[PDB]
Amino acid sequence: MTELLDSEQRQGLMIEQHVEAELANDPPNDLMWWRRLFRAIDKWAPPGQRLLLVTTEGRVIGAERSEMQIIRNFIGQADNADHPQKKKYGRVELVGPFSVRDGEDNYQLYLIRPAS
């Protein structure tokens, strides 16, 4: 588990703000409520990267089946949004958590990106 660079912290805060703003302007009238969330994180992912949302109940939005093992391992070690971190898993790297408010619901936001 590794400390973020100032640039990585700024990027996360910036992305969390854009995801929060997107959701604030997107009415929650979907038949599939999670699709609204996927629209926001698909749109604001940085090039070549993806975003994940985790609910307070421990459910992951945006992940592939192949990724649940490393996502599980990472979050099992992660701290609060007061101390986001990063970890490499072979060819990918997980970064977070960041924080996304959506009305009364709160999510943790993670980035998944090619490792470097």
Author numbering: 2 to 117
The publication says:
CpxA is the sensor kinase of the CpxRA system, a conserved Gram-negative envelope stress response that responds to perturbations to envelope protein homeostasis. Instead, CpxA senses a wide variety of cues that result from envelope stress, especially those arising from misfolded proteins that affect inner membrane integrity. While extracytoplasmic sensor domains adopt a variety of folds, many sensor kinases (and other sensory proteins such as chemotaxis proteins) possess Per-ARNT-Sim (PAS)-like domains in this region. While CpxA contains a PAS domain that is largely similar to the PAS folds of other sensor kinases, CpxA’s “non-canonical” dimer structure regulates its ability to sense periplasmic triggers; diverse inputs that disrupt the stability of the CpxA-SD dimer appear to activate CpxA kinase activity.
Like CpxA in Vibrio parahaemolyticus (CpxA-SDVib), E. coli CpxA-SD (CpxA-SDEC) adopts a PAS-like fold with each globular domain consisting of three α-helices surrounding a five-stranded antiparallel β-sheet in the canonical 2-5-1-4-3 topology. Like other extracytoplasmic PAS domains, CpxA-SD contains a long N-terminal helix (α1). However, this helix does not form the extreme N terminus of the structure, instead containing an N-cap motif at its N terminus and an extended tail region that folds against the β3 strand of the main PAS β-sheet (see later in Results for further discussion of this region). Overall, the monomer structure of CpxA-SDEC is similar to that of the CpxA-SDVib, with an RMSD of 2.9 Å over 108 atoms. While most of these are hydrophobes buried within the PAS domain, asparagine 107 (N107), lysine 121 (K121), and tyrosine 123 (Y123) are notable exceptions. These residues are also located within the deleted region of the constitutively activated and signal blind cpxA24 allele (Δ92–123) and form a hydrogen bond network connecting the α3 helix and β3 strand in our crystal structure. The asymmetric unit of the crystal provided a dimer structure of CpxA-SD where the main dimer interface centers around its ɑ1 helices, which cross each other roughly perpendicularly. In line with this, mutation of the M48 residue (M48K), which lies at the main dimer interface of this structure, did not lead to significant changes in the activation of CpxA or its ability to sense alkaline pH or NlpE overexpression, and CpxA M48K was expressed to similar levels as WT CpxA. This was surprising given the importance of sensor kinase dimerization and led us to conclude that this dimer orientation was likely a crystallographic artifact.
